[PDB]
Tab-separated table of C-alpha atoms and ligand atoms in Angstrom:
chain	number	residue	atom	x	y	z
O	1	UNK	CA	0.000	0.000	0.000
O	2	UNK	CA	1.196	3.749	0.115
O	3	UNK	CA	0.837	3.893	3.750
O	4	UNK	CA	0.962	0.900	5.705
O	5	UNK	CA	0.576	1.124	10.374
O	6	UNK	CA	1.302	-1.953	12.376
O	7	UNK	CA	1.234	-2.640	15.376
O	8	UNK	CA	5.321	-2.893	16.930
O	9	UNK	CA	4.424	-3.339	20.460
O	10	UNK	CA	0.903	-2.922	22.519
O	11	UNK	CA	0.203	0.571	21.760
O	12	UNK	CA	3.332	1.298	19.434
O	13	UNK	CA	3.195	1.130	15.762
O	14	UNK	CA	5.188	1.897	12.996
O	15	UNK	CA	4.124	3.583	10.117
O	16	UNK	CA	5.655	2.974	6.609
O	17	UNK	CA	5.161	6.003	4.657
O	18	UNK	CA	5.714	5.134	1.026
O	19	UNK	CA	5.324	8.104	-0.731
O	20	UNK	CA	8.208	10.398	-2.293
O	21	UNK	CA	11.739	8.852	-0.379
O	22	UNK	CA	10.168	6.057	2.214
O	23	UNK	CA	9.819	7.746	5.452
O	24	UNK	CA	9.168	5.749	8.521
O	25	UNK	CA	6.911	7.622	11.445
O	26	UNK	CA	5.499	6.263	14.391
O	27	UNK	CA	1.578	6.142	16.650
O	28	UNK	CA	1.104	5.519	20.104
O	29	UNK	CA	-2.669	4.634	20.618
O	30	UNK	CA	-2.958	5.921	24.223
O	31	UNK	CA	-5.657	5.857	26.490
O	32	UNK	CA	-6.706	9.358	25.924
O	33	UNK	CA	-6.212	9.894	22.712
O	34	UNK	CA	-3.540	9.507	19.606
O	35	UNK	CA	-0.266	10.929	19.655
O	36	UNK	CA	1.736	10.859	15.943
O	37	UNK	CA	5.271	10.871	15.987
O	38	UNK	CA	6.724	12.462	12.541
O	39	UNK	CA	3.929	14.583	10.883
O	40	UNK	CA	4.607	12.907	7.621
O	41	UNK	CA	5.800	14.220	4.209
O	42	UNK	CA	2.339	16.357	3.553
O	43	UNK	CA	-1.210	17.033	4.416
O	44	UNK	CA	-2.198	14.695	1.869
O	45	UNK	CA	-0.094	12.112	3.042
O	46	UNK	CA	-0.696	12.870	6.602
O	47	UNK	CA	-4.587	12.279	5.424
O	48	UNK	CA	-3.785	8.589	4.987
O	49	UNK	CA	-2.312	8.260	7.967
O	50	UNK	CA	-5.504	9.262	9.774
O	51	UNK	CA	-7.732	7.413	7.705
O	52	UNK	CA	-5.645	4.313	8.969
O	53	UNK	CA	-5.695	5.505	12.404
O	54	UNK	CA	-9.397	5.518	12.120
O	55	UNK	CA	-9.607	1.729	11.379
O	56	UNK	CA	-8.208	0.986	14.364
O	57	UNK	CA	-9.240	3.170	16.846
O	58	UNK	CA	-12.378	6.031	17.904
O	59	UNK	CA	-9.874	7.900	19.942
O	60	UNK	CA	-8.897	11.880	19.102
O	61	UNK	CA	-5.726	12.742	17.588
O	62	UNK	CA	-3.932	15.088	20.333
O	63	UNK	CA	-0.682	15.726	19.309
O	64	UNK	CA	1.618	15.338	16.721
O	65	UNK	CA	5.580	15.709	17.124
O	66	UNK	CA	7.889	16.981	14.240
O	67	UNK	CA	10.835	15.607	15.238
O	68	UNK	CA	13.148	18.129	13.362
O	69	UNK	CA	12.014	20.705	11.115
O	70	UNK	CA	12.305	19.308	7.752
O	71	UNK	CA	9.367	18.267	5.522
O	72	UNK	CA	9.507	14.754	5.861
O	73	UNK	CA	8.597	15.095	9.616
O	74	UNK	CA	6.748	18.213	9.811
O	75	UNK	CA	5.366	18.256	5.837
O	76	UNK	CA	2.047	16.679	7.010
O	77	UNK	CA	1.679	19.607	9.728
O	78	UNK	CA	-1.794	21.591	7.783
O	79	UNK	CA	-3.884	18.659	7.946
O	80	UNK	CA	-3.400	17.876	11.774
O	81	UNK	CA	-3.692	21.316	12.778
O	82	UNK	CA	-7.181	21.192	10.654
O	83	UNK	CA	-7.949	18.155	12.637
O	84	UNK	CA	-7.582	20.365	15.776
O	85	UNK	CA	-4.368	18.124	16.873
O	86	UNK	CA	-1.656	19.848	18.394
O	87	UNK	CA	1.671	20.447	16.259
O	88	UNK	CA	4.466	19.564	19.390
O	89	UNK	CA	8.203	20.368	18.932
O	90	UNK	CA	11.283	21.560	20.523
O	91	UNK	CA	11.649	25.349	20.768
O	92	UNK	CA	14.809	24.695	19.093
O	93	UNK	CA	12.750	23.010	15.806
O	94	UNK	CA	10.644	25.429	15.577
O	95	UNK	CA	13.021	28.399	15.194
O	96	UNK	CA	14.675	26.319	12.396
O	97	UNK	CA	11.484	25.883	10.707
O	98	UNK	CA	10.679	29.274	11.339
O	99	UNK	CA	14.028	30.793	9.369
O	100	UNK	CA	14.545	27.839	6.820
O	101	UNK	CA	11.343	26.101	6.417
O	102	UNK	CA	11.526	28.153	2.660
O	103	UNK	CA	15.284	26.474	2.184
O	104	UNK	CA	13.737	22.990	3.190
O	105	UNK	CA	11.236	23.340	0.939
O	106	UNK	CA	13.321	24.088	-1.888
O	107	UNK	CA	15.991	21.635	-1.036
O	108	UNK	CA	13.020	19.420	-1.378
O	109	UNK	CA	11.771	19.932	-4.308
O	110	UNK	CA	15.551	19.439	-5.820
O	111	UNK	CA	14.950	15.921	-5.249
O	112	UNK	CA	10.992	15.984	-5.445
O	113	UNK	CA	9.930	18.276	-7.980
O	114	UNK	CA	6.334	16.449	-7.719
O	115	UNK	CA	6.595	17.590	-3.887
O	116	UNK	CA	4.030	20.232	-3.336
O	117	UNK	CA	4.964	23.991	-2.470
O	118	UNK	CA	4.037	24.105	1.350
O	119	UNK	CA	3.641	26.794	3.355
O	120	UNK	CA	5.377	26.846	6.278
O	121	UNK	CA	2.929	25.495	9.130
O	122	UNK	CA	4.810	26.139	12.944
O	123	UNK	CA	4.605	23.756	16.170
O	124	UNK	CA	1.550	25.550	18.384
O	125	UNK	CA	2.429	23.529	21.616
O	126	UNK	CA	6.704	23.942	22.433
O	127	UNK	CA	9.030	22.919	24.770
O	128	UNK	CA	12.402	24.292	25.767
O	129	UNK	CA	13.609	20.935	27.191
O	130	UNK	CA	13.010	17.423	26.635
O	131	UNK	CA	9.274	16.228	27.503
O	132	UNK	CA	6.747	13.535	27.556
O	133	UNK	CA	3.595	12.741	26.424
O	134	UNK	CA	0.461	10.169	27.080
O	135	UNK	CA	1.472	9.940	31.085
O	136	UNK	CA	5.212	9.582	30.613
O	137	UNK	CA	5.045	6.717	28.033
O	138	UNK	CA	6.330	8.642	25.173
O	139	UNK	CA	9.817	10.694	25.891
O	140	UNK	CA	11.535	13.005	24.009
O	141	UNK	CA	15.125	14.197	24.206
O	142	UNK	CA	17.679	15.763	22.267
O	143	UNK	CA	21.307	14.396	22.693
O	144	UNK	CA	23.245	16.913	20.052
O	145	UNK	CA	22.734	17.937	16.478
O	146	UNK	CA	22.926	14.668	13.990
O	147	UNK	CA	21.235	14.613	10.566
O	148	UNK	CA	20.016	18.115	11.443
O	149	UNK	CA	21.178	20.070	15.014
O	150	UNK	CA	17.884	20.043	16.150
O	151	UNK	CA	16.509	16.215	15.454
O	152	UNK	CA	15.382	14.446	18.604
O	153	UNK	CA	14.946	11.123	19.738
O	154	UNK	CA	11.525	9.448	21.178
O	155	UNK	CA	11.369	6.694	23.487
O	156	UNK	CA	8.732	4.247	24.730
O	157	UNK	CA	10.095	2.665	27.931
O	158	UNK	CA	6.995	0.296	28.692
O	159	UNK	CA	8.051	-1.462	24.970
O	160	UNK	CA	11.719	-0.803	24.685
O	161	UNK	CA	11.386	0.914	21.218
O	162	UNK	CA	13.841	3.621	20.415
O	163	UNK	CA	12.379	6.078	17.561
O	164	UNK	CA	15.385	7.469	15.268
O	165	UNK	CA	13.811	9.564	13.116
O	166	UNK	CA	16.145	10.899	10.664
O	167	UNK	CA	19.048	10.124	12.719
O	168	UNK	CA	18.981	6.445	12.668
O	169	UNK	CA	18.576	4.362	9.314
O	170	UNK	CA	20.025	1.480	7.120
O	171	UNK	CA	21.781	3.520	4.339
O	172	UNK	CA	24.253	6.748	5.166
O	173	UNK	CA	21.907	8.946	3.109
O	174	UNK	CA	22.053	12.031	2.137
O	175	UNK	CA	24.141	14.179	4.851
O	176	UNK	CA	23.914	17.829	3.795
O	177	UNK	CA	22.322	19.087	6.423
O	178	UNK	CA	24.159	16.770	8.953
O	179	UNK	CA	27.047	17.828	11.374
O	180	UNK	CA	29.234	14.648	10.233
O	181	UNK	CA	32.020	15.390	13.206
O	182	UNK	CA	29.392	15.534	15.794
O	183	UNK	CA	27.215	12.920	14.614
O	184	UNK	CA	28.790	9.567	16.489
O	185	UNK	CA	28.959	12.142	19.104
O	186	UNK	CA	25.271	12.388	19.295
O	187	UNK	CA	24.993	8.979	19.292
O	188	UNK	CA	27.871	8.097	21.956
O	189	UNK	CA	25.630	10.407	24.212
O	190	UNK	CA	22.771	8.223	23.107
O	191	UNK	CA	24.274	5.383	24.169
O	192	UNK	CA	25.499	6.368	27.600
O	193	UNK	CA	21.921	7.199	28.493
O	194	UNK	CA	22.234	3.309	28.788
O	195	UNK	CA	18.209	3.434	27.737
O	196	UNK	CA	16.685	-0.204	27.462
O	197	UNK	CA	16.700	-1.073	24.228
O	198	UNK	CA	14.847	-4.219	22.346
O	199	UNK	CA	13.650	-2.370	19.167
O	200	UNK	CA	15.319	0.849	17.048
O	201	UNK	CA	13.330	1.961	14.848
O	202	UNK	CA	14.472	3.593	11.717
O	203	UNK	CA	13.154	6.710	9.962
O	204	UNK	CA	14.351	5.672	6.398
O	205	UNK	CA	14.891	2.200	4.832
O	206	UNK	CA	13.306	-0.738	6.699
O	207	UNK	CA	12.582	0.266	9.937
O	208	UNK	CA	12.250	-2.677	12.784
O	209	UNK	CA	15.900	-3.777	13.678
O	210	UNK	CA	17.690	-4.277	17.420
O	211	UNK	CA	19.609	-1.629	19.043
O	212	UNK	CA	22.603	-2.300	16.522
O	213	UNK	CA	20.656	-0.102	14.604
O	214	UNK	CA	23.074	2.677	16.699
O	215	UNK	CA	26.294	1.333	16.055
O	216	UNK	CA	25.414	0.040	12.332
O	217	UNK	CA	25.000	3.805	11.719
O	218	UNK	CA	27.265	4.893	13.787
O	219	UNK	CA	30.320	3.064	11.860
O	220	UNK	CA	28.666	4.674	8.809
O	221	UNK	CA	29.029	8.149	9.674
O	222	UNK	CA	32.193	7.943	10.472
O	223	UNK	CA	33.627	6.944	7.471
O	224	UNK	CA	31.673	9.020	5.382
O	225	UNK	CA	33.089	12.971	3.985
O	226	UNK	CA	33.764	15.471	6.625
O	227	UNK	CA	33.831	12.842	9.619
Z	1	CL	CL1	-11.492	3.106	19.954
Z	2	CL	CL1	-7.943	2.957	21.337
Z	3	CL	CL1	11.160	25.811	-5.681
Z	4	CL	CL1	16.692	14.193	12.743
Z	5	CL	CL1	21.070	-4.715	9.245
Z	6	CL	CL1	18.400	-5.718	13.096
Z	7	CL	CL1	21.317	-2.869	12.187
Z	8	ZN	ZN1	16.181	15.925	6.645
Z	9	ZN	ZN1	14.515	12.025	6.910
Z	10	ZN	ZN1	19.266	-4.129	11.790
């Protein structure tokens, strides 16, 4: 399918967001309500997300977190604002997206030229730390600037699933945007949090793999141009 949610673990699933470069996002079905991790590539994409959220559950969409400020986690931002969910990020993201949303856009659409022309859309609910969400079982944290300086982790301790977003993936990517010296230095800090770990997933390529996930990147990075 174009869009595809499973369940990972009780109330975690991943989503599999085919369209444009394969971004992977994830849902927490929470007892309250929804809460969307990665906004998706665009309102139109973020659509089909909700229309699969609706087959599985009644439950209101609160929040949704862009977990940097480029499009493929914050493109989808319109629609869930039009839904009445709340657009949650890091004051940090939402400066970026603020000043360069334009650059993203176009950087985008380099790639993409079918992408759509968005306008920029800003995170109404932001934090200046790290924070949590559905009664502590979804935590987010920044650990130092990776594939962008502002990306940010999110954890799930009850299910030991790591979200990577951007930062954690199968193939090295694209890295302009990416502080290549500080990168294994992000995820050395990542590490040390000594965070149990069953299940990484990855924003990009395949996304259910084990914590080597870290150090398959990791090794990666640092070979790569500028490290
Ligand atoms: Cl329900
Ligand atoms: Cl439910
Ligand atoms: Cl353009
Ligand atoms: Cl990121
Ligand atoms: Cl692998
Ligand atoms: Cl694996
Ligand atoms: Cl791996
Ligand atoms: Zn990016
Ligand atoms: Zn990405
Ligand atoms: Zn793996």
């Amino acid at each position: 399918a174009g869009m595809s949610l499973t369940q990972v673990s009780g109330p975690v699933y991943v989503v599999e967001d085919n369209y444009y470069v394969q971004e992977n996002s994830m849902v927490y079905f929470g007892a309250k309500g929804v809460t969307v991790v990665g906004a998706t590539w665009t309102p139109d994409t973020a659509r089909e997300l909700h229309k699969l959220i609706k087959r599985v559950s009644r439950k209101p969409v609160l929040e949704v977190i862009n977990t940097n400020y480029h499009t493929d986690r914050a493109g989808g931002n319109a629609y869930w604002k039009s839904i009445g969910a709340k657009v949650v990020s890091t004051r940090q993201t939402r400066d970026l997206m603020k000043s360069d949303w334009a650059e993203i856009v176009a950087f985008t659409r380099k790639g993409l030229p079918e992408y759509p022309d968005l306008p920029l859309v800003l995170p109404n609910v932001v934090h200046d730390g790290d924070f949590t969400l559905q009664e502590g079982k979804v935590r987010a944290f920044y650990a130092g600037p990776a594939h962008t300086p502002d990306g940010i982790f999110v954890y799930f301790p009850d299910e030991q699933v790591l979200y990577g977003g951007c930062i954690l993936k199968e193939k090295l990517g694209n890295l302009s945007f990416a502080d290549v010296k500080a990168y294994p230095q992000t995820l050395e800090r990542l590490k040390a949090m000594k965070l149990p770990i069953k299940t990484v997933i990855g924003g990009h390529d395949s996304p259910l793999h084990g914590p080597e996930l870290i150090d398959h990147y990791e090794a990666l990075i640092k070979a790569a141009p500028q490290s």
